[PDB]
Amino acid sequence: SPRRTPQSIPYQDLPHLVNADGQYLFCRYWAPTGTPKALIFVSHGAGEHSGRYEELARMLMGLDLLVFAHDHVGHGQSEGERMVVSDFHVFVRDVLQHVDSMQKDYPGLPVFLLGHSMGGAIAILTAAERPGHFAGMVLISPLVLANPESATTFKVLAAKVLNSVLPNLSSGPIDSSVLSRNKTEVDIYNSDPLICRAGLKVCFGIQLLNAVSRVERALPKLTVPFLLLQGSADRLCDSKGAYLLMELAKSQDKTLKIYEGAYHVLHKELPEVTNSVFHEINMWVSQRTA
Ligand SMILES: O=C(c1ccc2nc(-c3cccnc3)oc2c1)N1CCN(c2nc3ccccc3c(=O)[nH]2)CC1
């Protein structure tokens, strides 16, 4: 009997990739009609999935880039216990596998990364693992420093799991209403059956603590060009992390745009913010693929 997604769809009916642990990852592709100018991988964040990026991917494909993505392990239509990961580097390893596979099918093309929130930390660590190989990185509120209160409060819960055997202990779920001012986008996110609504298991949040620690160590070695978009009112990825990334990365091509008053999910924010986000990513990628 065929391997099926967590939603019961046979993987034989869907674009897919099997990772190093034998787990099926659901894949998405948006390819132009002409010859692509570059490849770009879209890295989604915790609890969500690659389908959230449909509009942004179609914009990028309109610039004649070949856009590709997968649902990370434990997310969306990929396999794995929901919101569990043996080690955060699994996400990075799996991105590199997909990138490597695509560079075979479309050799000679520059490859970019785009990531949001946890997906932005994945993008950072992916670039850091292959210095000099990626053409650029677009970061939308990447997880660099967590909100100090959410980091401390959770690090307490972590000390419990780290010292005892408590496999089901979890934090409370994050309130999606504090992550975008656009109420319609909040309602859409809360209506998507592929989104994981439960609170973070402490074991997973420990891996997000690991992500931040590894990002910190990676910064003074990071050289990839990047565009960094950050809201000033981000309740999840503290804006101080965006400033620290601008200060500590060694990249010769780094740009920060701050959206004053905007919340965490900038590509799902008020229309004036989201329209600007799309425009600025368009300009940045266009200038680096011309
Ligand atoms: O990746 C994360 C994310 C999640 C939970 C985390 N907990 C920590 C954490 C904990 C302790 C210590 N250090 C870090 O880091 C996190 C990162 N994301 C991206 C996808 N998200 C999203 N939210 C929306 C809300 C409204 C409307 C649209 C959307 C939308 O499209 N996506 C939610 C946030």
Side-chain angles (χ1 to χ4, degrees), residues 111-210:
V111 184
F112 290 79
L113 297 170
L114 184 152
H116 164 61
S117 196
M118 184 192 72
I122 294 166
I124 289 164
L125 298 175
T126 297
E129 186 150 330
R130 307 265 184 99
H133 286 288
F134 289 96
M137 186 165 72
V138 174
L139 300 171
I140 306 174
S141 40
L143 174 61
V144 175
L145 289 177
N147 171 270
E149 150 175 319
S150 296
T152 292
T153 294
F154 180 79
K155 278 170 186 175
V156 168
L157 274 181
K160 284 45 188 160
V161 160
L162 288 186
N163 283 278
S164 288
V165 179
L166 297 166
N168 298 322
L169 203 72
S170 94
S171 313
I174 183 60
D175 181 2
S176 61
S177 69
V178 307
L179 302 182
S180 172
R181 294 174 301 172
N182 187 322
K183 291 157 136 58
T184 304
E185 296 277 23
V186 174
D187 284 330
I188 288 170
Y189 189 75
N190 292 338
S191 301
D192 183 347
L194 289 178
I195 300 297
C196 178
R197 308 162 179 170
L200 282 196
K201 287 237 207 136
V202 176
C203 70
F204 193 80
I206 284 158
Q207 294 303 326
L208 296 182
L209 296 176
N210 289 342

Side-chain angles (χ1 to χ4, degrees), residues 51-93:
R52 299 258 70 219
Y53 295 86
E54 186 66 33
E55 247 202 281
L56 194 56
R58 290 185 173 278
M59 182 274 286
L60 287 164
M61 173 184 62
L63 307 174
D64 289 330
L65 279 82
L66 200 171
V67 189
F68 65 117
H70 61 247
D71 292 349
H72 301 302
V73 151
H75 289 72
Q77 303 183 67
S78 293
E79 289 185 321
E81 186 171 357
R82 306 289 81 183
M83 304 205 71
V84 172
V85 77
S86 63
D87 179 277
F88 195 80
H89 185 264
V90 164
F91 295 142
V92 175
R93 178 198 70 186

Side-chain angles (χ1 to χ4, degrees), residues 4-41:
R4 295 178 185 262
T5 67
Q7 305 79 27
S8 299
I9 303 184
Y11 281 107
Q12 70 185 9
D13 298 338
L14 297 174
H16 63 264
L17 186 66
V18 184
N19 75 4
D21 294 319
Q23 298 167 303
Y24 277 74
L25 304 184
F26 167 78
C27 300
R28 292 191 191 267
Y29 303 92
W30 302 260
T33 52
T35 305
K37 280 238 69 185
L39 305 171
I40 183 161
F41 181 89

